[PDB]
């Protein structure tokens, strides 16, 4: 679909990803993309790295244990984390209805 000027969350369905994770691609341009990622308690964002882009994610709701290149913090709503290209990063949700807003430059 076309990118949105205005993303209205409650008008937009979830895309189910399996294993307690679902998402909404919110909007994007050539240079930026924003995605809402929703986690059940215990859902795991499997550790991975991106060769060619950076990622900053905002904790919109709930809480997570986030591990980045072997450093690990518990983050709650209002917090954020940075993973630059080639840094391994993953997240474990600590409660239902936990949400990360991921931003990156694809």
């Amino acid at each position: 679909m076309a990118s949105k000027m205005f993303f209205i969350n409650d008008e937009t369905p979830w895309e189910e990803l399996g294993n307690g994770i679902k998402r909404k691609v919110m909007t994007w341009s050539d240079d930026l993309m924003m995605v809402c990622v929703h986690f059940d308690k215990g859902a795991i964002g499997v550790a991975h790295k991106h060769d060619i882009h950076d990622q900053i994610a905002y904790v919109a709701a709930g809480s997570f244990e986030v591990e980045i290149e072997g450093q690990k913090r518990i983050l709650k709503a209002g917090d954020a984390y940075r993973a630059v290209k080639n840094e391994m990063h993953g997240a474990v949700s600590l409660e239902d209805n936990s949400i990360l807003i991921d931003t990156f430059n694809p």
Binding site: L17, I21, R23, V25, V35, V37, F39, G45, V46, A47, H48, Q55, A57, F64, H89, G90, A91, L100, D102, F104
Partner: peptide, 7 residues
């Protein structure tokens, strides 16, 4: 992203 899925 914060999960391992891409698009």
């Amino acid at each position: 992203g914060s999960s391992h899925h891409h698009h």
